[PDB]
Every structure is written in structure tokens, then in C-alpha cells.
Design a protein around this ligand. Structure first.
Ligand SMILES: N[C@@H](CCC(=O)O)C(=O)O
Ligand SMILES: N[C@@H](CCC(=O)O)C(=O)O
Ligand SMILES: [Cl-]
Ligand SMILES: [Cl-]
Ligand SMILES: [Cl-]
Ligand SMILES: [Cl-]
Ligand SMILES: [Cl-]
Ligand code: NA
Ligand code: NA
Lengths: 255, 254
């Protein structure tokens, strides 16, 4: 029998979660969510077995500007510590330079999560002021977008986030949501995750539209033969609408 | 170094002939979103190119009897073009035989029709025959319907196939004209619908997106340009240059 593939992932509702149960669960049986359903479809169509492992450092992945090293799921793939990353992992220029991605299984963009009842309507409006703090997940794609942007509004926002980083950069989306709920703080968040959150907490809203456009893809080490195979499997699922059905299943609930 | 041969197809606002009273020659004949994209790719990757319209006028589909591809897809399979730079949908059946860059635009199939009617979805079309409907022959929309297992879309394919000589058309332009001049709904890509409805205030999109797909640059399978073009697209997207190009070419109605 062929070696089981090691699949790195990260906890992020409704993509990847621990199942609720009173008895202890083991192995792959611990996990559920959209990305777990996707993994299951990939494994049956491509004919592999797998072991799910949560990324050890708890990060998506960014490059350190001083020493040039990556972290997170991206680094696990670079180092061949995982065969695949099946997660809400954004396909980005800087990541595509060092790892391979399948074509996207979902498309999205950065937007803003905030409390209802405000005249703030856009990133421009946030950038012009400092009473309302704002931030993003540390060492993820949203942070990196702001750090690399040459657009004046976003450059200004990065200077603020960077100055205040110990307070405004958070370690998970969950922590960002709690900051929105417990302080005067707006969270720069991926739009598909905002959709999930605002359907379940009717005090919160999206502010403005999408700031960029990107996709989530399955990550592989650079050169992996699984990359193109997984692209084909994803495209075949899209011929029959099975990914939008999986999205409906995990985003169903609202406000 | 050798200029890459770029296959393309006329499709507003992606690729058009420039208007002028004097004759134009070579690459200078063309403009549009995809032409602006090609220029950016060529500067960033450092190649020169020659644009050639696909001779058969097709995007590309597989013949159900003899297994041959046509259109831009066939030009790439046969190594007659180095790149296809066009509103060319990335699809499973195409990806099996050619390579694509990652998407420069995302979209889905939807419906173009007149305003003011009770038709609100594909299901409403599928259950009747008074209002005819169709798609571009030998494109990705047609192929989606031909391959679909979903009952509504399978019923719609049976109708299109029965009525093909009348309801399958050779271009989006032809499909628009059928909507405007007969009781006909056109199954059309949503970014093209957005362009059309901004300029035909009696037309509208019906329902939402029927599927999810992207447009990518096509290459022959195994080409080294595929990954380089993906990186250049991704770099344009980290600065919002593609949405600005979209805005330039899409530019309304009361
Ligand atoms: N999905 C992101 C993390 C969340 C965010 O950056 O907003 C990533 O792939 O890095
Ligand atoms: N863009 C399509 C043609 C138009 C359509 O099929 O709606 C293709 O790549 O085949
Ligand atoms: Cl509000
Ligand atoms: Cl889908
Ligand atoms: Cl098949
Ligand atoms: Cl790819
Ligand atoms: Cl963009
Ligand atoms: Na790569
Ligand atoms: Na391919």
C-alpha cells in the first residue's frame, strides 16, 4: 500500500473544525468542515489515503523580512513536512513563487468586518482616522497584501497596523471577531469568512466591497505532481456544481 | 528572440478591431481588455508577439464522433500558437489537453433576456418551449450543458440540441441580436452580460450564476509560459491592476 499523504491544515470555521462529541475522537475522524469534505472527494477521485495534521506553528504563512524564512503551512510545504495543504489558503504571488497551488476551489476578496450602525463605508474612511483601530491576522495573506501594497490608502493602513501590531494583528480570525465585539475595532477579513460570521451574528456587518480578488487553492510543494491532478479534480467537481453544494452545506443557517 | 504567436478571437470588450479611417497593420489593428493584458504580460516577461485571429472562429470543443478539437484549443494542441489570450474559459475538458494560467477574471454562466417578464431562472426556461434559448456553438457554455448531469440543465441541453440550427449561434454578438429581435434568452458568461446590459437598457441578467469558472491564458500542454504567466497575473492582482483594466473596458442605464 502507498504511503498516506500528510495533509497540513488549520482550524477555521466552517472550513476545518473539531467535531463536537462527548467521546474522544481519533485520527482523521476528529475533523469536519468544507475543506475536510473537499479532501475526502480528492482522496477518493485521485486514489490516496491521508493523515490530517494541524500546522504546528498555527500560521498560514508569511516571509520574515530580516531572515527571508517562511512560516506556517507554506513553510511546511517548502520543507516537505506535508504533501498537501488543504485549508482556506489564499493563492498569492509571493506564495506561488515558493510553493505550487491548484487552481482555485473558491473565490473571495479582502473586506472589512465591523459593528452595525456607522458612517464608516470603506477602507478610505478607516485609513483617514485612528479612533477606530483596525487589523488583520498576523502572518496571513491579508497582512501581506497591506504590507506590499503601493496604493496610498492601503500603505497608510499598513503603517498604522505595523505601528500598533502587538495590539491590532491577531492570531486567528476568531480573535479578530472577538476584538470587533469587545472594542472599537474593524477587522480586515476574507469575504467568504465575513459571510459566515455576519449570518450568525446579527450585530456585525461587512463594510464596503472587496478590496482585492483571489482564490483559495490546495497547496503542494513546488514541483509536486499532485498540483495538476488536484486542479483537474477541482474543475471536474465544478462541472457538476459540487463545490457550490459543499459551500451551501457549510454556510447554511440567518439574520 | 522569436515573437510568440498569440491566438485570439473577436469579442467585445476583450478583443476588438480599432476604429480608424486609415488601414491598420499587424498588432496595431487590435484593442481591448485582453490586448491590454497581453501588453502587460509581454513587458513583464520580456517577449514580443504576433496576434492572429483563430482561423475557424471558434473557442474550442471536442467533436463527439471523431474526437478532434477545434478553435483556439486545437491551435494550442497542434503547436500553431504559443498562447491563447482571449476570454477563454478554464474547464476540466480543456485542462486535460492544454494548460492554462491561473484566472485573470472570474465569472459564471447566466442568462441574458428582455426585462419585464416572469422568467427568473434556468428552471423557468427549461419547463417551456415558447421562449427559445441557446448558447455559442463550440464554446464552454454549450459544453457545460452537454455534459451536465443536473436534471434542469440536461433538459435544456436536449432542447438546444433538438433546435441547434436555430438556437446555437456563432458568436455572442449573434446571440445578443437574437435576444433583441425574437423571443429568445441567451445563456452567456456573466462578465459579458454585465457589459451588454450596461449598453442595452431593455436587457437584463436573469437569475444568478449557474456555475463558477475563470478565464485563463491558454498554452500548449507542458509550456514553460503557463507558470510564468500565472505569476505575472498574480502580481497584477496584488496591486489591483486587473480590476482597473476591467473598469477601463466596462466603463449606464436609468
Ligand atoms: N486565508 C488567509 C488567512 C486569513 C487572512 O489573511 O485574512 C491566508 O491564506 O493567509
Ligand atoms: N468564453 C467561452 C465562449 C462563450 C460561451 O461559451 O459562453 C469559451 O471560452 O468557450
Ligand atoms: Cl449597518
Ligand atoms: Cl461548483
Ligand atoms: Cl469525461
Ligand atoms: Cl495552475
Ligand atoms: Cl486586480
Ligand atoms: Na509555484
Ligand atoms: Na493541462
Amino acid at each position: 500500500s502507498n504511503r498516506s499523504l500528510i495533509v497540513t491544515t488549520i482550524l477555521e470555521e466552517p472550513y476545518v473544525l473539531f467535531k463536537k462529541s462527548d467521546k474522544p475522537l481519533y485520527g482523521n475522524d476528529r475533523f469536519e468542515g468544507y475543506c475536510i469534505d473537499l479532501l475526502r472527494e480528492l482522496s477518493t477521485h485521485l486514489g490516496f489515503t491521508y493523515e490530517i495534521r494541524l500546522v504546528e506553528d498555527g500560521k498560514y504563512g508569511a516571509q520574515d523580512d530580516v531572515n527571508g524564512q517562511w512560516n506556517g503551512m507554506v513553510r511546511e510545504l517548502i520543507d516537505h513536512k506535508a504533501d498537501l495543504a488543504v485549508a482556506p489558503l489564499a493563492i498569492t504571488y509571493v506564495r506561488e513563487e515558493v510553493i505550487d497551488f491548484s487552481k482555485p476551489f473558491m473565490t473571495l476578496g479582502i473586506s472589512i468586518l465591523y459593528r452595525k450602525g456607522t458612517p464608516i463605508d470603506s477602507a478610505d474612511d478607516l485609513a483617514k482616522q485612528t479612533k477606530i483601530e483596525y487589523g488583520a491576522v498576523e502572518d496571513g495573506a491579508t497582512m501581506t497584501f497591506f504590507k506590499r501594497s503601493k496604493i496610498s490608502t492601503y500603505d497608510k493602513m499598513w503603517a498604522f497596523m505595523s505601528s500598533r501590531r502587538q495590539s491590532v494583528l491577531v492570531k486567528s480570525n476568531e480573535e479578530g471577531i472577538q476584538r470587533v465585539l469587545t472594542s472599537d475595532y474593524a477587522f480586515l477579513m476574507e469575504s467568504t469568512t465575513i459571510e459566515f460570521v455576519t449570518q450568525r451574528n446579527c450585530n456585525l456587518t461587512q463594510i464596503g466591497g472587496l478590496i482585492d480578488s483571489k482564490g483559495y487553492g490546495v497547496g503542494t510543494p513546488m514541483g509536486s505532481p499532485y498540483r495538476d491532478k488536484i486542479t483537474l479534480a477541482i474543475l471536474k467537481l465544478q462541472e457538476q456544481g459540487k463545490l457550490h453544494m459543499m459551500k451551501e452545506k457549510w454556510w447554511r443557517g440567518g439574520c
